[PDB]
C-alpha cells in the first residue's frame, strides 16, 4: 500500500532507481489521522512488534500546561487558529503537533483564584455570584494571610495573558502527536512565542 521506502526515489545524481524487490511490510505507511475537533473518538492500530498506536480521530479535551506558573490542567480545545505547515489544516480544523489552538482558561483562572492575593485588578463590572467570593476573600488567620501576601509579592501576569483571560480563551501549542498517541497535549503560549504567533495570526487575518 502506502510505502515509506527510499528506493522509489531518484538518486542524488538524479539517475533513475530500479527496484530489486517488491514492497515490504515493514516499509508500509498508513493514512493520516486528520484529528478534528469533536467528541473523543480514538481508534487503535496494531503496529510492528505487537505494540499499539492510538490513532485519534476526534478530540475536544487536552492536558495543556501553563509553563510559567507550572500549572497544567485538563482543558477543552475550542478552535485552531494557526498552522505553520498548511493553511488548510486550520480551515479544516485538524489537531496536529505544533498547531496553535484556543483552549479554555477556566481551570487556570480558577487555580489563579486559589493563588489570588493581588491588589485591585479588573473587578469593575463585578459578578455578584455568592459562594464564589469565598475563594477570594474568605475568613483566614493571620499567618495564612501572611503567606498569601508573600505569594502576592511574586505575582506577575503578562498583559497579553490578561487580555486572553478576559475572553475566556487561551493560545496554546500542541506538543503531542494526536494521530500517534491519541492525546492532544501542550503548553499555553507565553512571552515572545505568544507575541510571534499573535503577529502570525494577525497577518494571516
Amino acid at each position: 500500500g502506502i510505502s515509506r521506502d527510499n528506493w522509489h526515489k531518484r538518486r542524488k545524481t538524479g539517475g533513475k532507481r530500479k527496484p530489486y524487490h517488491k514492497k515490504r511490510k515493514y516499509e508500509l505507511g498508513r493514512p493520516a489521522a486528520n484529528t478534528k475537533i469533536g467528541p473523543r473518538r480514538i481508534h487503535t492500530v496494531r503496529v510492528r512488534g505487537g505494540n499499539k498506536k492510538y490513532r485519534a480521530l476526534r478530540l475536544d479535551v487536552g492536558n495543556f500546561s501553563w509553563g510559567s506558573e507550572c500549572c497544567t490542567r485538563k482543558t477543552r480545545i475550542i478552535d485552531v487558529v494557526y498552522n505553520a505547515s498548511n493553511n488548510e489544516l486550520v480551515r479544516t480544523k485538524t489537531l496536529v503537533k505544533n498547531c496553535i489552538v484556543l483552549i479554555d482558561s477556566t481551570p487556570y483562572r480558577q487555580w489563579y483564584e486559589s493563588h489570588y492575593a493581588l491588589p485591585l485588578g479588573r473587578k469593575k463590572g463585578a459578578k455578584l455570584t455568592p459562594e464564589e467570593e469565598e475563594i477570594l476573600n474568605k475568613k483566614r488567620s493571620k499567618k495564612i494571610q501572611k503567606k498569601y501576601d508573600e505569594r502576592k509579592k511574586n505575582a506577575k501576569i503578562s498583559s497579553l495573558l490578561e487580555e486572553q483571560f478576559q475572553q475566556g480563551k487561551l493560545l496554546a501549542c500542541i506538543a503531542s502527536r494526536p494521530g500517534q498517541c491519541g492525546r492532544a497535549d501542550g503548553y499555553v503560549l507565553e512571552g515572545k512565542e505568544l507575541e510571534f504567533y499573535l503577529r502570525k495570526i494577525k497577518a494571516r487575518k
Binding site: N6, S68, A84, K156, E193, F196, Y197
Partner: protein, 151 residues
C-alpha cells in the same frame, strides 16, 4: 538580525524562556539562556555557538545531533545551500595489475552550522558522522581549517 524568519517559532527545545521575572530587578532584555554541549573526541565548542543566537536543530553543538562513527575531512567546493555545503574528498585508488594509482573523488553534502561563519570555498573542514539529516546529508562540520592560500 531576526531569528524568527520561518512560519513557526524558532527556539532551542531544552531552554525555557518564559520564567517569571522581577519588575524592579529587570531593565532591558536581561539574558536568554543558551543550550550548548561539548562533543567528544577533543573538539572544542566554537565561541559563536556558545554566545550566538542562531537556532539550528542539526548543529552538533547547539542541536539534537550526536557525532558518532567516522571522522573525515574534505575541502569546501560549493556553498549554495541553506546550512548545507558540498565538500570534495580526493583519494588515490590502487590498481593491482598496473601497480599504480588513479585520482578519484566523492562529493559529500555535509551540514554546516551557523557557528562557522565566513567559511570559504577551498577551506579544509573536519566532518563527523551523524544520523541521516536529509536525503543525502549524513555528516556535520565540526571544525573549519582556513586554507593556506587565505588572508
Amino acid at each position: 538580525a531576526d531569528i524568527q524568519t520561518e512560519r513557526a517559532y524558532q527556539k532551542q527545545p531544552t531552554i525555557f524562556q518564559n520564567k517569571k521575572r522581577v519588575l524592579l530587578g529587570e531593565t532591558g532584555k536581561e539574558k536568554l539562556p543558551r543550550y550548548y554541549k561539548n562533543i567528544g573526541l577533543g573538539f572544542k565548542t566554537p565561541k559563536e555557538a556558545i554566545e550566538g543566537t542562531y537556532i539550528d536543530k542539526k548543529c552538533p553543538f547547539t542541536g539534537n545531533v550526536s557525532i558518532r562513527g567516522r571522522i573525515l575531512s574534505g575541502v569546501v567546493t560549493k556553498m549554495k545551500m541553506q546550512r548545507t555545503i558540498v565538500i570534495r574528498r580526493d583519494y588515490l585508488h590502487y590498481i593491482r595489475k598496473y601497480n599504480r594509482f588513479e585520482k578519484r573523488h566523492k562529493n559529500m553534502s555535509v551540514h554546516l552550522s551557523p557557528c562557522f561563519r565566513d567559511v570559504q570555498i577551498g577551506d579544509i573542514v573536519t566532518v563527523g558522522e551523524c544520523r541521516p539529516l536529509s536525503k543525502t546529508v549524513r555528516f556535520n562540520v565540526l571544525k573549519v581549517t582556513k586554507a593556506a592560500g587565505t588572508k
